[PDB]
Amino acid sequence: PLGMSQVQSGILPEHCRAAIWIEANLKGDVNALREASKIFVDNVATFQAKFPDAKLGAVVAFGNNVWRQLSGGEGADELKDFPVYGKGLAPSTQYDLLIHILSARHEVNFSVAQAALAAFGDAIDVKEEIHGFRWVEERDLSGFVAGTENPAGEETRREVAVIKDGVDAGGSYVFVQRWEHNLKQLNRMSVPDQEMMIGRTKDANEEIDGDERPVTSHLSRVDLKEDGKGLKIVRQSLPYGTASGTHGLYFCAYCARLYNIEQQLLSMFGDTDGKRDAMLRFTKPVTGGYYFAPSLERIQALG
Amino acid sequence: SQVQSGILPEHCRAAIWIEANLKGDVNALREASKIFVDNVATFQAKFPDAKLGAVVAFGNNVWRQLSGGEGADELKDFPVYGKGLAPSTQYDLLIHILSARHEVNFSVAQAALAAFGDAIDVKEEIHGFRWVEERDLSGFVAGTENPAGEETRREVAVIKDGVDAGGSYVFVQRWEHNLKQLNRMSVPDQEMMIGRTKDANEEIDGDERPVTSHLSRVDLKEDGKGLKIVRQSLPYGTASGTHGLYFCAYCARLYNIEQQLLSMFGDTDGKRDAMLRFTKPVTGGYYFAPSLERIQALG
Ligand code: HEM
Ligand code: HEM
Ligand SMILES: O=N[O-]
Ligand SMILES: O=N[O-]
Ligand SMILES: [Mg+2]
Ligand SMILES: [Mg+2]
Numbered sequence: 001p002l003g004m005s006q007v008q009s010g011i012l013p014e015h016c017r018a019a020i021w022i023e024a025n026l027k028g029d030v031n032a033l034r035e036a037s038k039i040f041v042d043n044v045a046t047f048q049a050k051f052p053d054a055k056l057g058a059v060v061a062f063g064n065n066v067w068r069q070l071s072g073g074e075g076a077d078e079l080k081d082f083p084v085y086g087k088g089l090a091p092s093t094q095y096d097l098l099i100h101i102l103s104a105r106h107e108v109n110f111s112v113a114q115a116a117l118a119a120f121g122d123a124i125d126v127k128e129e130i131h132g133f134r135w136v137e138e139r140d141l142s143g144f145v146a147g148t149e150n151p152a153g154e155e156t157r158r159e160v161a162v163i164k165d166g167v168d169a170g171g172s173y174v175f176v177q178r179w180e181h182n183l184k185q186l187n188r189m190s191v192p193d194q195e196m197m198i199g200r201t202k203d204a205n206e207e208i209d210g211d212e213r214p215v216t217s218h219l220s221r222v223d224l225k226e227d228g229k230g231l232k233i234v235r236q237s238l239p240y241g242t243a244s245g246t247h248g249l250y251f252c253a254y255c256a257r258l259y260n261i262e263q264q265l266l267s268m269f270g271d272t273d274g275k276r277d278a279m280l281r282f283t284k285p286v287t288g289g290y291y292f293a294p295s296l297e298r299i300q301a302l303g
Numbered sequence: 304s305q306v307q308s309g310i311l312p313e314h315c316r317a318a319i320w321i322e323a324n325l326k327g328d329v330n331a332l333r334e335a336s337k338i339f340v341d342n343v344a345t346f347q348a349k350f351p352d353a354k355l356g357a358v359v360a361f362g363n364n365v366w367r368q369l370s371g372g373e374g375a376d377e378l379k380d381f382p383v384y385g386k387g388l389a390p391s392t393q394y395d396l397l398i399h400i401l402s403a404r405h406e407v408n409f410s411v412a413q414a415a416l417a418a419f420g421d422a423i424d425v426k427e428e429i430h431g432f433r434w435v436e437e438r439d440l441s442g443f444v445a446g447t448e449n450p451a452g453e454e455t456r457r458e459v460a461v462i463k464d465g466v467d468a469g470g471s472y473v474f475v476q477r478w479e480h481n482l483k484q485l486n487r488m489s490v491p492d493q494e495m496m497i498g499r500t501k502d503a504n505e506e507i508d509g510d511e512r513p514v515t516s517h518l519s520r521v522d523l524k525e526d527g528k529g530l531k532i533v534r535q536s537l538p539y540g541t542a543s544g545t546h547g548l549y550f551c552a553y554c555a556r557l558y559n560i561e562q563q564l565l566s567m568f569g570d571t572d573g574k575r576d577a578m579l580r581f582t583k584p585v586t587g588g589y590y591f592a593p594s595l596e597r598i599q600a601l602g
Contacts, residue, residue, distance in 0.1 A: 017406075022543065106317075106405070107434045113542035126543040135406045243412035244321065244425040 005170030005295040009044060010057035010100050011234070011254050012157050018106040019132040019238050020113045021176060021250060022099040023289065024124040030069045032123035033062075033097070034302040039119040040099075041299050047112050056103035058112060060299060061174045061291035063096045070302065075167040078258040082175075082290045086269030086276065090177070093287040095127050098174060100252065102236065106131070128287070130178065130250045132238025140249055141181055141239050142282070144198050145205040149223070150235050161234040161254040170295030173258040178240075178287040181248040186282040197278035199223075216278040222264045231260040248283060258290065304469030304594035308343060308356035309399050310533065310553050311456050315354070317405035318431040318537050319412045320475060320549060321398040322588065323423040329368045331422040332361075332396070333602035338418040339398075340598055346411055355402040357411060359598065360473045360590035362395045369601060374466040377557040381474075381589045385568030385575065389476070392586040394426055397473060399551065401535065405432070427586060429477060429549045431537025439548055440480055440538050441581070443497050444504040448522070449534050460533040460553040469594025472557040477539075477586040480547040485581040496577040498522075515577040521563045530559040547582060557589065 026033065037060050044058045062070065064079050081094040099116045101109045113129070140146040151160045163171050186194065191202055199219030200207050213220060224231045233253040241247025255261050268277040325332065336359050343357045361369060363378050380393045396419075400411045412428075439445040450459045462470045485493065494500050498507050498518030512519060523530045532552040540546025554560050567576040 020542070106432055110432070110542060111435055117542055129541045129543045131541070133405055133409070136410060242428045242430065243319070243409060243416055244428045 006297055007158070007162050007170045007172070008041070008057075008059045008293055008296050008299070009048070010059035010102055011161050011172055011293065012154055013055060013057045013102060014152070014157070015134075015138075016055065016057075016102040017104050017134045018109055019100065019102040019236065019250075019252075020109045021101075021128075021130045021132070021252065022097075022113060022116060022126060023095045023128050023176065023287070024097045024099075024120070024126045026066055026096040026123065027125050028123055030066050033066065033070065033120070036119040036121070036123060037299050037302055040116050041296060043115040043119065044112065047108060047115070051103075051105065051108050054103040054105040054108040056101070056105075056108055056112065058102070059098070059100040059174070059293050061098040061100070061293040063094055063098075063289065063291055066096045067292045076171075076292045078173065079292050080290065082288045085265045085271060089276065089280070090265060090269045090285050090288055092289075093127070094289045097124055098176060098289070098291040100174070100236070106133070128178070130240050132240050132250050135239045141183065141241075141247055142186055142194070142198075144194075144200065144202055146237065146249070147235065148200075148205060151232055157234050160232045161256055163256045168294070171298065172254045172256060172293045173261070174291040174293050175251075175253050175255075175258075175261045176287070176289055176291070177251040177285045179248040179251060179283045179285050180246055181283040183247075183282070189282070197281065214278065215273075216275050218277055218279055221268045221277045224263055224267060231263055233260050233264070251285075254293070304596050306457070306461050306469050306471070307340070307358045307592055307595055307598075308347070309358035309401055309535075310356070310460055310471055310592065311453055312354055312356045312401060313451070313456070314433075315401040315535070315537075316403045316433045317408055318399065318401040318535065318549075318551075319408045320400075320427070320429045320431070320551065321396075321412065321415060321425055322392075322394045322427040322475065322586070323396040323398075323419070323425045325365055325395040325422065326424050327422040329365055330602075332365065332369065332419070335419040335422065336598050336601060339415050340595060342414040342418065343411065346407065346414070350402075350404065350407045353402040353404045353407045355400075355404075355407055355411065357401070357415075358397070358399040358473070358592050360397040360399070360592040362393055362397075362588065362590055365395045366591045375470075375591045377472065378591050379557075379589065381587045384564045384570060388575070388579075389564060389568045389584050389587055391588075392426075393588045396423055397475060397588065397590040399473070399475075399535070405430070427477070429539050431539050431549050434538045440482065440540075440546055441485055441493070441497075443493075443499065443501055445536065445548070446534065447499075447504060450531055456533050459531045460555055462555045467593070469596065471553045471555060471592045472560070473590040473592050474550075474552050474554075474557075474560045475586070475588055475590070476550040476584045478547040478550060478582045478584050479545055480582040482546075482581070488580070496580065513577060515574050517576055517578050520567045520574075520576045523562055523566060530562055532559055532563070550584075553592070
């Protein structure tokens with residue numbers, strides 16, 4: 001549709017059961033990312049045509065250094081390399097390229113991931129590939145329901161995640177961060193203590209009032225308002241891993257303003273008020289990066 | 304004697320395999336196995352749509368101890384085949400979980416680990432998934448000639464009588480595919496390597512395909528009697544890292560599996576399976592899956 005800016009298909013879908021994230025560095029000349037990105041989004045359209053019931057979406061997104069090159073420095077004014085927070089409590093592993101694929105069918109996501117790798121070829125060095133899965137009752141592996149207060153429905157998710165006007169219209173900022181859960185440590189905590197750590201009840205998933213939970217509770221850290229206006233984000237996080245090996249949450253969020261994500265990280269990691277998130281008692285982040293997801297027509301026009 | 308629930312279900316969408324060694328007292332496996340099979344029954348009741356099943360199976364040394372040397376006459380440690388071309392990684396314990404729902408399998412695998420606790424040392428945990436059109440990652444449909452329906456699957460996989468009635472022998476072997484090597488082959492050449500056409504999945508006449516084709520290696524008859532097995536194999540891995548097929552088969556006789564391995568790996572006639580051009584096995588083990596009644600009678 002001329003004069004408009006179409007969002008990449010992976011930002012908005014809700015309740016998808018499976019995802020693949022690929023994070024990679026650029027190995028050679030940045031020009032190689034131009035044709036590869038166009039091939040990949042075309043492949044996504046082909047898979048959507050072949051598998052209409054998968055409800056597939058995907059996003060290509062770029063780190064600061066390569067996006068500044070590809071854009072000539074226009075727009076994406078908030079973009080920067082992911083900093084450390086809490087002096088290293090949240091480590092930084094900023095890469096050049098993020099691919100996020102999500103759908104109702106893991107097997108379709110796998111084919112799409114293979115297509116991404118064929119498009120980019122040896123221009124990229126893959127740093128990790130994570131297969132996310134929705135767990136029972138949409139719970140995080142800790143046993144708490146994850147997603148309840150996420151923006152709901154296309155209209156509100158667009159408001160929160162999608163830039164509305166100007167050169168970046170239809171684009172979004174992305175944050176990804178892989179957490180490694182220590183479930184043995186979690187299971188040493190009583191359920192009441194776990195509920196004070198999160199800020200919601202475990203079985204029934206009821207919010208515990210802000211004046212009845214510690215300021216270190218996760219909800220107290222991240223449910224932030226500025227003069228009454230919530231700093232909302234669109235989360236796409238999923239569980240990942242093996243039962244006997246590494247497992248946790250692959251955190252992913254989209255926002256039209258990087259600012260909202262950063263304020264939540266400054267809060268969680270001790271930089272705002274000297275207190276940190278209680279979830280650090282059982283889980284820790286081991287990666288972190290910021291990316292810019294251009295509109296689809298900005299990709300299709302790379303050249 | 305009732306069969307363990309994971310042998311017979313067809314067309315699973317996802318599986319988890321856990322291979323482990325015994326670190327503690329062999330007697331710890333008795334109570335743990337009973338706990339786990341009860342967990343599986345509870346999960347089936349909670350998730351009836353999942354069509355969940357699971358199997359606990361034991362390596363030769365531990366099974367001889369748990370059984371007092373009675374039955375399981377064919378059981379032995381997995382040897383190398385082809386003098387080492389197929390490696391051997393025999394462990395003490397196999398747990399196989401399968402269903403329509405990966406997330407249910409994950410909860411079941413956590414329950415297995417809780418039941419066995421620190422008596423076991425996990426050596427491998429593999430998450431299988433059914434790919435598009437039930438194809439192996441090579442692009443060839445996998446499973447077409449597998450026994451179909453409970454009647455025939457019981458005939459092939461489940462021991463009929465005696466002390467082992469309701470049990471089965473299990474073989475597991477992880478393969479690592481090199482899809483770059485595969486993709487350098489023309490499609491006609493790939494078809495002659497497998498023995499079936501790629502898109503349409505039609506058998507190529509045995510008289511017109513190479514004797515090294517996969518089907519010529521594994522579709523074996525003895526005076527016209529097919530040496531059938533029940534395969535539960537699935538794709539696994541990451542797109543950018545290691546990926547392949549996790550091969551898994553059940554049979555009432557270990558013999559049928561072993562004859563296929565001797566054929567594939569050059570021991571029978573000096574010829575090897577043509578798929579070794581692009582994929583290779585990296586683990587291998589044999590296990591005995593007792594009936595449920597036998598498990599209940601352990602401790
Ligand atoms: C180990 C990692 C994490 C776990 C297990 C986790 C878990 C949860 C849970 C259980 C909830 C409550 C239900 C819900 O409304 O979704 C929640 C809410 C939320 N989380 Fe997290 N989370 C993690 C990391 C993060 C990070 C890193 C951020 C932000 C940078 C974040 C932002 C949010 C937000 C904004 C909410 C909604 C709060 C509200 O408005 O009520 N989470 N999370
Ligand atoms: C890389 C590993 C393997 C791959 C990709 C593979 C793939 C295939 C394919 C594409 C077929 C044809 C369709 C079908 O009927 O299922 C097939 C058939 C079969 N495979 Fe394999 N296979 C592998 C390993 C093995 C092993 C290790 C064995 C036995 C020990 C085996 C036994 C069989 C049998 C019995 C059949 C049916 C043959 C017939 O009666 O037509 N396969 N396999
Ligand atoms: O709130 N973590 O998706
Ligand atoms: O024939 N391999 O499942
Ligand atoms: Mg709130
Ligand atoms: Mg035949």
